[PDB]
Design a protein around this ligand. Sequence first.
Ligand SMILES: [Mg+2]
Ligand SMILES: [Mg+2]
Ligand SMILES: [Mg+2]
Ligand SMILES: [Mg+2]
Ligand SMILES: [Mg+2]
Ligand SMILES: [Mg+2]
Ligand SMILES: [Mg+2]
Ligand SMILES: [Mg+2]
Ligand SMILES: [Mg+2]
Ligand SMILES: [Mg+2]
Ligand SMILES: [Mg+2]
Ligand SMILES: [Mg+2]
Ligand SMILES: [Mg+2]
Ligand SMILES: [Mg+2]
Ligand SMILES: [Mg+2]
Ligand SMILES: [Mg+2]
Ligand SMILES: [Mg+2]
Ligand SMILES: [Mg+2]
Ligand SMILES: [Mg+2]
Ligand SMILES: [Mg+2]
Ligand SMILES: [Mg+2]
Ligand SMILES: [Mg+2]
Ligand SMILES: [Mg+2]
Ligand SMILES: [Mg+2]
Ligand SMILES: [Mg+2]
Ligand SMILES: [Mg+2]
Ligand SMILES: [Mg+2]
Ligand SMILES: [Mg+2]
Ligand SMILES: [Mg+2]
Ligand SMILES: [Mg+2]
Ligand SMILES: [Mg+2]
Ligand SMILES: [Mg+2]
Ligand SMILES: [Mg+2]
Ligand SMILES: [Mg+2]
Ligand SMILES: [Mg+2]
Ligand SMILES: [Mg+2]
Ligand SMILES: [Mg+2]
Ligand SMILES: [Mg+2]
Ligand SMILES: [Mg+2]
Ligand SMILES: [Mg+2]
Ligand SMILES: [Mg+2]
Ligand SMILES: [Mg+2]
Ligand SMILES: [Mg+2]
Ligand SMILES: [Mg+2]
Ligand SMILES: [Mg+2]
Ligand SMILES: [Mg+2]
Ligand SMILES: [Mg+2]
Ligand SMILES: [Mg+2]
Ligand SMILES: [Mg+2]
Ligand SMILES: [Mg+2]
Ligand SMILES: [Mg+2]
Ligand SMILES: [Mg+2]
Ligand SMILES: [Mg+2]
Ligand SMILES: [Mg+2]
Ligand SMILES: [Mg+2]
Ligand SMILES: [Mg+2]
Ligand SMILES: [Mg+2]
Ligand SMILES: [Mg+2]
Ligand SMILES: [Mg+2]
Ligand SMILES: [Mg+2]
Ligand SMILES: [Mg+2]
Ligand SMILES: [Mg+2]
Ligand SMILES: [Mg+2]
Ligand SMILES: [Mg+2]
Ligand SMILES: [Mg+2]
Ligand SMILES: [Mg+2]
Ligand SMILES: [Mg+2]
Ligand SMILES: [Mg+2]
Ligand SMILES: [Mg+2]
Ligand SMILES: [Mg+2]
Lengths: 83, 104, 99
Amino acid sequence: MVKIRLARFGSKHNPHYRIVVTDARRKRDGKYIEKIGYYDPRKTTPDWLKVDVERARYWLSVGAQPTDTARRLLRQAGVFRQE
Amino acid sequence: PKKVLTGVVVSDKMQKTVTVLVERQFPHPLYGKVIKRSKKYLAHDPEEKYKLGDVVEIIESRPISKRKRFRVLRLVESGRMDLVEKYLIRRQNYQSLSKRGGKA
Amino acid sequence: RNLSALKRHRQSLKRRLRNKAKKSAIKTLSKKAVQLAQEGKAEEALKIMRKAESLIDKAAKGSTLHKNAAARRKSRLMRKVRQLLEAAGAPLIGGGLSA
RNA sequence: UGGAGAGUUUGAUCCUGGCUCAGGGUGAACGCUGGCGGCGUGCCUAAGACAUGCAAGUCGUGCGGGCCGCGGGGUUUUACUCCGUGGUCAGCGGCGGACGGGUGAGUAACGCGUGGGUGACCUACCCGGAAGAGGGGGACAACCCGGGGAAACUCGGGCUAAUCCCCCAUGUGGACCCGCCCCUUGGGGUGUGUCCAAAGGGCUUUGCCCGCUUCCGGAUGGGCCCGCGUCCCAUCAGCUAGUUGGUGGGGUAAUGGCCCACCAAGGCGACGACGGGUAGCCGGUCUGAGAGGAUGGCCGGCCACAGGGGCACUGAGACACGGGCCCCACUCCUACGGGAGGCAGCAGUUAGGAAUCUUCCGCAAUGGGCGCAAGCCUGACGGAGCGACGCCGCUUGGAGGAAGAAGCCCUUCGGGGUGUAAACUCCUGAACCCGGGACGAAACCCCCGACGAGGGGACUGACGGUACCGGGGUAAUAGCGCCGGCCAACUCCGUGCCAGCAGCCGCGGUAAUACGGAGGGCGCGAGCGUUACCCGGAUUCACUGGGCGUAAAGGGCGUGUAGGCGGCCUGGGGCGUCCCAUGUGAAAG
Ligand SMILES: [Mg+2]
Ligand SMILES: [Mg+2]
Ligand SMILES: [Mg+2]
Ligand SMILES: [Mg+2]
Ligand SMILES: [Mg+2]
Ligand SMILES: [Mg+2]
Ligand SMILES: [Mg+2]
Ligand SMILES: [Mg+2]
Ligand SMILES: [Mg+2]
Ligand SMILES: [Mg+2]
Ligand SMILES: [Mg+2]
Ligand SMILES: [Mg+2]
Ligand SMILES: [Mg+2]
Ligand SMILES: [Mg+2]
Ligand SMILES: [Mg+2]
Ligand SMILES: [Mg+2]
Ligand SMILES: [Mg+2]
Ligand SMILES: [Mg+2]
Ligand SMILES: [Mg+2]
Ligand SMILES: [Mg+2]
Ligand SMILES: [Mg+2]
Ligand SMILES: [Mg+2]
Ligand SMILES: [Mg+2]
Ligand SMILES: [Mg+2]
Ligand SMILES: [Mg+2]
Ligand SMILES: [Mg+2]
Ligand SMILES: [Mg+2]
Ligand SMILES: [Mg+2]
Ligand SMILES: [Mg+2]
Ligand SMILES: [Mg+2]
Ligand SMILES: [Mg+2]
Ligand SMILES: [Mg+2]
Ligand SMILES: [Mg+2]
Ligand SMILES: [Mg+2]
Ligand SMILES: [Mg+2]
Ligand SMILES: [Mg+2]
Ligand SMILES: [Mg+2]
Ligand SMILES: [Mg+2]
Ligand SMILES: [Mg+2]
Ligand SMILES: [Mg+2]
Ligand SMILES: [Mg+2]
Ligand SMILES: [Mg+2]
Ligand SMILES: [Mg+2]
Ligand SMILES: [Mg+2]
Ligand SMILES: [Mg+2]
Ligand SMILES: [Mg+2]
Ligand SMILES: [Mg+2]
Ligand SMILES: [Mg+2]
Ligand SMILES: [Mg+2]
Ligand SMILES: [Mg+2]
Ligand SMILES: [Mg+2]
Ligand SMILES: [Mg+2]
Ligand SMILES: [Mg+2]
Ligand SMILES: [Mg+2]
Ligand SMILES: [Mg+2]
Ligand SMILES: [Mg+2]
Ligand SMILES: [Mg+2]
Ligand SMILES: [Mg+2]
Ligand SMILES: [Mg+2]
Ligand SMILES: [Mg+2]
Ligand SMILES: [Mg+2]
Ligand SMILES: [Mg+2]
Ligand SMILES: [Mg+2]
Ligand SMILES: [Mg+2]
Ligand SMILES: [Mg+2]
Ligand SMILES: [Mg+2]
Ligand SMILES: [Mg+2]
Ligand SMILES: [Mg+2]
Ligand SMILES: [Mg+2]
Ligand SMILES: [Mg+2]
């Protein structure tokens, strides 16, 4: 399909992922369709997860499948909060 | 948009196809002076409608053959063999430039 | 050595035959139908024409033809068949054809 | 926010003019030297040949089995036989193997870049929407029996399940021929006629979960076509016969001489055809005041390739690196008939070369394939290792300390230098020891809620006892080049146109600041030099920004083709030109 997933962008021992929408067949760090957020798993700065829930939802609405963590991150920035 | 070019028919010698000569002025990259330069397009004339020396608009279109990817759209200005003769002398001169020469 | 792309290879040999024979069927039928139209045998040529149209749409159900691959071979066929019964025909059984 | 010039033709001068230097850059190599850490980077040659290991599998929730077990049944008991269940093995079947990873050999090409076209197209999985799954039949492995082969493997007979294959029905709908309608290339509607559907599985079993079928739509990914751009040789000037177009057909998902038959005689070229050479292209990189010049190495995009040459099959997709067939070259097995290979995947070996790494750890993270999931696979990947190869950071101490040791070197014999340097006094405390010890990880899963939103819980770290913190604590590596001018830095001895130096000018012929050593000095410093190459200076191919009376440069002169250029006034168009709005110009840099 087309995926929402993380692309690796930090450096050695210093990981920062970009939450991106891409055809599942690209290399993980290759040309993607759209960035919709980022993620520092080390929580080094107070702003360590950002999403944009509109695009996040757009893509979902055309069945981009999130990975088991992209979905995790997405959730946490209330993408799926429906109330 | 399908590219539309305007040019001069310099060939009737085929069936259902006319050869259009399309010029284009543009300033030269390095030296700046405005240079002419022109290319021949084989264009599709299903009615053998357009004649030698007609000025026609030509349109980008789905392939009709090798070489042919343009069809003749509208007639712009009727007959004028000046441009043709021009193009005709151009090609005639080629007779001289070789290993020999004389009276062309 | 030895994998099980090995399987896939032998698998593909099987399908090769399913297809080969399906496609074979059509040609020999299509020809038949058309050939009978040159002779202007209306009811019978349409009777074959129909069975042809079937194996074509049918081949297409799976990955032998699928597609507009069918629509071509199908179009290509009804054309030559009607054109050829312009030899006094009167589409008898009127099988696969529109009035 | 941006621009330096110098040395060298002469006895001297101005100019012309080449050569050389000062700057920057590097996947480097070579010498002398070498202590620590972080992050990068590392066969430029032979796209030479490759040992060994590992690199793409997975699903028992599609299906039937074989082998080794264990338990429970029918009988009064056994022999037989039925059911349940553990381990394992393949087979059929599904999805994946067309991604990921490697390379730049070929390619001067819509290959690439860029902007468009597609009424000429495809798209598995994924999302949305509409409708549907009713009867019937078949075969081939597995397994069983028999052969041929040394082996790789192979042939024959028989049995059998399925989400395997087929026939009928249902026609939401869809395909096709003809006609009409709008549209305008093959777009969308419509009426007869024909034609085309489906698969089952699992359950905490009437009610959901996973699948299946057809159609429309979306998302992603692609095919093809076009405008413009893309190196050198004209000491390559003519080229072409599927050639150029037409009609009909074949082919494809789709256009097309893509292929074929018949017809016409066309098509391309000085705006460089054809040929020859070289080359993956780009984002970018280096340089430059810029305009330019040079490059395409890490990374990202596209392309092409998988020992060399062809070819199709399977499939949503391949003409298919770790699939198939054939020819060729090479290696290895061989019972002479016949077989087996393909690291430009990770490591590694060998060869070539000035020169280029570990046969490492881990699936903890991120990503991919299959799976309902548990999970499995992943040399993608995350890490570590090696090399001063690069960048950055850091140490080899700090404060005191003589009119000023000793040694070494000058000297006018009075002295001057190395030199606060050393010693020595005090202070701090790289290394080293001791203790604490990470971040990267919270999801999948499970429970509550409804299998949704939301809340609750459990598991998991290769790197690694590393990073970081704390306590303890030793004065603890310095080289390399240069010192005539350019060009920062001068003295003695030695040598005698020798030995030698030298980037260019030039030094050495017995008083050499130019050779070799010494003392001293200059510049950088875990590096310093050399060689190689690119841009710069070089307005030294000059568009910006040069020249041709004598420095190199006016054609021996004409006539004239193409081409370039073109007086005054008015009007039309608006091609160049100018302006506004807008789309594009991914990421990285
Ligand atoms: Mg036959
Ligand atoms: Mg066609
Ligand atoms: Mg002179
Ligand atoms: Mg002189
Ligand atoms: Mg002078
Ligand atoms: Mg000079
Ligand atoms: Mg400069
Ligand atoms: Mg050494
Ligand atoms: Mg390292
Ligand atoms: Mg190489
Ligand atoms: Mg390499
Ligand atoms: Mg393994
Ligand atoms: Mg018993
Ligand atoms: Mg199995
Ligand atoms: Mg690749
Ligand atoms: Mg070229
Ligand atoms: Mg060439
Ligand atoms: Mg092409
Ligand atoms: Mg389109
Ligand atoms: Mg649907
Ligand atoms: Mg049955
Ligand atoms: Mg049976
Ligand atoms: Mg049995
Ligand atoms: Mg046997
Ligand atoms: Mg049999
Ligand atoms: Mg219907
Ligand atoms: Mg129409
Ligand atoms: Mg229609
Ligand atoms: Mg109809
Ligand atoms: Mg039916
Ligand atoms: Mg059921
Ligand atoms: Mg699309
Ligand atoms: Mg011909
Ligand atoms: Mg044709
Ligand atoms: Mg000719
Ligand atoms: Mg090459
Ligand atoms: Mg310049
Ligand atoms: Mg590259
Ligand atoms: Mg090779
Ligand atoms: Mg096929
Ligand atoms: Mg291989
Ligand atoms: Mg091997
Ligand atoms: Mg060697
Ligand atoms: Mg993993
Ligand atoms: Mg994973
Ligand atoms: Mg001191
Ligand atoms: Mg102390
Ligand atoms: Mg302390
Ligand atoms: Mg897990
Ligand atoms: Mg519950
Ligand atoms: Mg939760
Ligand atoms: Mg000391
Ligand atoms: Mg000086
Ligand atoms: Mg001597
Ligand atoms: Mg040099
Ligand atoms: Mg002397
Ligand atoms: Mg002398
Ligand atoms: Mg000296
Ligand atoms: Mg010197
Ligand atoms: Mg220049
Ligand atoms: Mg000059
Ligand atoms: Mg002269
Ligand atoms: Mg003269
Ligand atoms: Mg002369
Ligand atoms: Mg003239
Ligand atoms: Mg004028
Ligand atoms: Mg003019
Ligand atoms: Mg005017
Ligand atoms: Mg204009
Ligand atoms: Mg950018």
